[PDB]
Design a protein around this ligand. Structure first.
Ligand SMILES: [Mg+2]
Ligand SMILES: [Mg+2]
Length: 174
């Protein structure tokens, strides 16, 4: 339930109804504690809910937390660091994969710092279709605001020093 440094793990995201959403085949673990998992991936296979596949185009650092309802992908592109933030259940890890539930809402952060809250329409549809309970709705809306504050504070994976440390750590181990 705590992956080891240098372990190659699968990441499996689900929807609230239990169907798989998206699977990443290979992520190398850089840090594994009780609260935080940090990993790196680069040209990993990605599997869609219909089984269709594609391969990621650039290195990324992934950040997972046991007590926050979000996780963060930090993508290294030509014109800087992009963040893609999934509102989510907190993660659980076992011998199959690190697993979480994707809850539709996402935030994209551009290299200039500007962020956009995405998928309010997708969230409203799924919350009605899959009958998300009221307490999950409260938690998710409260975690959108926490994530915006973390981005504005440059907290956690949004810290420039976080990027420098884990980018260089992953470059060495790969
Ligand atoms: Mg998402
Ligand atoms: Mg979405």
């Amino acid at each position: 339930s705590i992956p080891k440094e240098g372990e190659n793990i699968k990441i499996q995201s689900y929807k609230h109804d239990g169907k798989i959403h998206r699977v990443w085949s290979e992520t190398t673990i850089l840090k594994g504690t009780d609260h935080v998992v940090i990993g790196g991936n680069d040209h990993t296979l990605v599997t869609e809910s219909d089984g269709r596949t594609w391969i990621t185009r650039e290195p990324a650092i992934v950040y997972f937390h046991s007590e926050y309802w979000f996780n963060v992908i930090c993508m290294f592109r030509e014109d800087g660091i992009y963040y893609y933030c999934n509102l989510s259940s907190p993660f659980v890890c076992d011998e199959e994969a690190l697993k979480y539930i994707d809850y539709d809402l996402d935030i994209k952060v551009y290299p200039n710092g500007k962020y956009h809250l995405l998928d309010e329409d997708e969230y409203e549809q799924h919350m009605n279709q899959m009958n998300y309970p009221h307490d999950i709705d409260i938690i998710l809306r409260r975690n959108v605001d926490i994530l915006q504050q973390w981005i504005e504070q440059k907290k956690g994976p949004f810290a420039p020093d976080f990027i420098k440390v884990w980018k260089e750590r992953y470059k060495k181990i790969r």
